[PDB]
Chain A
Amino acid sequence: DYAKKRGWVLGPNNYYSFASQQQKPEDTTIPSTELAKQVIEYARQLEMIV
């Protein structure tokens, strides 16, 4: 009941649980957008009169 209730397909006598979950590949693009937003803001509130 546990086996067919949770995971660990017991095929070749092996009970395996997925415990790697690396994901997050080389993804410079999301930086390439949000970091540009960020730097534009730095330069925004740097020379404007306070």
Chain B
Amino acid sequence: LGLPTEAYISVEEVHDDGTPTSKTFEHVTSEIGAEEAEEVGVEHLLRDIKDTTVGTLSQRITNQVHGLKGLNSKLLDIRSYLEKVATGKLPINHQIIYQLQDVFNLLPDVSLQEFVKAFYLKTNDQMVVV
């Protein structure tokens, strides 16, 4: 499960190690768009399978299950890379390690303090109207 395109632009990188200037790619966010003269054709052709399990059916699939599967694949990728550093490959930079340390530092505080009180309040209010 994924998205079929990626976008890249070319830039020059300085270095703090005194390594010479490097010519290297950089990432740009992307999406699919549409035109009214085409989506008529796309929909005429999309006679292949089920879709549109309406409303509450489509939410949880589209934004829980197919979310968690992605997040899992990403963490497996990091997992694999941190093997090669077992002498299989040189530590590509302290940069990547600094970034990882930010990741494990930022993640939300333990759900143990008076945050809990603030959570119960909204759950009550969320359910009452239901």
Contacts and interface: CB of A to CB of B under 8 A. Distances in A.
A and B touch in the complex (CB under 8 A): yes
Interface of A: 26, 28-29, 35, 42-43, 46-47
Which of A26, A35, A42, A43 has the largest count of B CB atoms less than 10 A from its CB? A26
5 contacts: A26-B116, A26-B117, A42-B130, A43-B56, A47-B57
Interface of B: 55-57, 60, 111-114, 116-117, 119, 123, 130
Contacts of A26: 112-114, 116-117
Contacts, number: 17
Main secondary structure of the interface of A (DSSP, over half): helix
Contact of B55 (A29, A35, A47): A47
